Amino acid sequence: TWLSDFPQAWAETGGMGLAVRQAPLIIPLKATSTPVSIKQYPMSQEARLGIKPHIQRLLDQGILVPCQSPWNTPLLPVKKPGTNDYRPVQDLREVNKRVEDIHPTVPNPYNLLSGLPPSHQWYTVLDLKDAFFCLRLHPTSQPLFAFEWRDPEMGISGQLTWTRLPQGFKNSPTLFDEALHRDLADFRIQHPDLILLQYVDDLLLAATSELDCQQGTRALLQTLGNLGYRASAKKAQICQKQVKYLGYLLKEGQR
Amino acid sequence: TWLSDFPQAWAETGGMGLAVRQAPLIIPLKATSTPVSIKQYPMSQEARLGIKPHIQRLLDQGILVPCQSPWNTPLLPVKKPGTNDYRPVQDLREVNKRVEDIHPTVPNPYNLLSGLPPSHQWYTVLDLKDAFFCLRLHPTSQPLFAFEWRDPEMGISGQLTWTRLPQGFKNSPTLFDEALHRDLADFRIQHPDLILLQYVDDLLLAATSELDCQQGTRALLQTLGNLGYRASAKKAQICQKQVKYLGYLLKEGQR
DNA sequence: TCTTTCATATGAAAGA
DNA sequence: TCTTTCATATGAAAGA
């Protein structure tokens, strides 16, 4: 009954996350950067209707807020399904080019998995839900990610922007990985006998025995929930001696 | 009156050359080569008429002879003039591929000219006329360069081939350069004070004084005529302190 | 809608 | 006429 033992740690029961220990993020711009305002491309009603529910949900969650900004990038309608229901995809390339680069500290999967000993063969894999959105964005950096939102027959103001680290931003993967690392530093200390691999929002906990993986997982879920992160109970692979992680199938210590 | 002093050395008065000291050339084939017979491409009457005079001239000169050979390559009509009179150009690529490679000993112009001292500023430039044709081809290697020749209203046999080193053959430049070098070895010895640069059929004689270039040129022309080679009196640049050679303008020791 | 990268296609130019 | 090399052109595929 893992789901019932940790209501706060699961995305399905704890609600949208928010990394309470993490200071809102400030995004430094390159020395010569000037705001860029790209006009929203005309969107068909079908695309607009498909995307609308998502935008309203984000507005209700406080993830998106109204604003007036000298910055503006295109909102694209992308239909993932065979050919149904669109999802909003912001083209932040012109913003990314004006943001100062940071060193990429996210290790590649191959190197990351090299730190997995043969001794620990009991695994638990957790996938953090809406990870980036868990990291707040400082009010000063929020205007940078603005886009235009219209509602033909009667639309609100015009521009909306994010209050959390957004998708499409070049440094989101790295900033999230580093923030979670800071938040889980203590856990690594109070659990020297465990192996924890972090790849942005993909986590792998390794133990020597089933029990250790059991007690370890409880502690990790507990800690994650308290810190403000949320794991997908649906995808969770708990205390298995065989799991799928980062495109690899871990079994008998292979791959 | 250079032309009158050396009737045998000039192409205009000595007739077609023939390197009498040079043994007829034998062309070694690659170890796995088999004869290749490529059908002559249909030729328009205009092209055929343009080329005809050249073929007859070569037949009269003994440069071309009738033959029956398992080898055959295409004869191409190429009109050099703005758009008039064609000249025969044999496509010997399939033959070249079956001939054993030899080391390229013809130096590049740049390196060749590097052997020209500042001391010798009096120059003479000679261009050997129909140089390759001066070198006989051994009867055994003649069948290799055969092509088909037709004369619609009544044509002779069919195939013709060369009795002299032909144009289009990959090793002609090198074999000619080496043969002339062998024939002019003595001259270089009896004239230590002269500079002789050889680039296939392009010759440059350098002297320190006008007189030396004068006496030197006489000796070279004499020797060339006796050996069977012929220089173009028309193009000849005699005892000039400024001449055009291999695309360069030699003046004051520059270039 | 845009941009960027990489593969496949044409085409021109030489030469035998 | 054929072949070979190199430049210019399209086009497809990804992704934000």
Question: For residues A219 and A191, is the Cβ–Cβ distance under 8 A?
Answer: yes
Nucleotide nearest to B43 (CA to C1'): D1
Q: Please, which experimental method was used?
A: X-ray
DSSP-assigned states of every residue in chain B: -HHHH-TTTBHHHH-S---TTSPPB--PBPTT----BPPPPP--HHHHHHHHHHHHHHHHTTSEEEE--S-B--EEEE--SSS---EEEE--HHHHTTBPP----PPPHHHHHTT--SS--EEEEEEBTTHHHHSBB-TTTGGGG-EE---TTS--SSEEEESBPPTT-TTHHHHHHHHHHHHTHHHHHH-TT-EEEEETTEEEEEESSHHHHHHHHHHHHHHHHHHT--B-TTT-EEEESEEEETTEEEETTB-
Hey, what are B171's tokens?
């090793």
Structural domain for A129, as ranges: 2-27+102-135+165-250
Q: What is the CA radius of gyration of chain B?
A: 20
Question: Is any atom of strand D within 7 angstroms of residue B94's beta carbon?
Answer: no
Question: Is any atom of strand D within 7 angstroms of residue B130's beta carbon?
Answer: no
Provide the domain count of chain A: 2
B20 and B72 share one domain: no
Question: For residues A49 and A87, is the Cβ–Cβ distance under 8 A?
Answer: no
Question: Is any atom of strand D within 7 angstroms of residue B91's beta carbon?
Answer: yes
Tokens 């070249």 sit on residue: B96
B61 and B13 share one domain: no
> From residue A234, how far is each of A61, A237, B79, B196 by CA, in Å?
22, 9, 80, 90
| Residues in Cβ contact with B74 at an 8 Å cutoff, skipping those fewer than 6 apart | B38, B39, B40, B41, B90, B91, B147
A70 and A177 share one domain: no
CATH number at residue B183: 3.30.70.270
A49 and A8 share one domain: no
Residue B61 CA, chain-centre distance (Å), reads: 15
Tokens 């002269």 sit on residue: B194
Question: Is any atom of strand D within 7 angstroms of residue A168's beta carbon?
Answer: yes
A194 and A89 share one domain: no
Q: How far apart are the C-alpha atoms of B198 and B131, rounded to whole Å? A: 13
* A11 SS3 class: helix
Which resolution, in Å, applies to this structure?
Answer: 2.2
Q: Binding site residues of B for RNA, as ranges? A: 41, 91, 93, 107, 171, 173
Tokens 């328009």 sit on residue: B44
CATH number at residue B65: 3.10.10.10
User: Which nucleotides of chain D are near protein (any atom < 7 Å from a CB)?
Assistant: 1-3, 16
Q: What is the dihedral of CA A217, A222, A226, A228, to 10 degrees?
A: 40
Q: How far apart are the C-alpha atoms of A213 and B223, rounded to whole Å? A: 100
Q: How far apart are the C-alpha atoms of B110 and A57, rounded to whole Å? A: 77
B72 and B151 share one domain: yes
Q: Binding site residues of A for RNA, as ranges? A: 41, 91, 93, 107, 171, 173
* A93 SS3 class: helix
Q: What is the CA radius of gyration of chain A?
A: 20
B60 and B177 share one domain: no
A123 and A198 share one domain: yes
Question: Is any atom of strand D within 7 angstroms of residue B97's beta carbon?
Answer: no
A129 and A200 share one domain: yes
Give the residue with minimal CA–C1' separation from D16.
A91
Handedness of CA B131, B134, B138, B141 (dihedral sign): positive
- Is B255 within the bounds of a domain? no
B129 and B155 share one domain: no
- Is A160 within the bounds of a domain? yes
Hey, what are A54's tokens?
């998502």
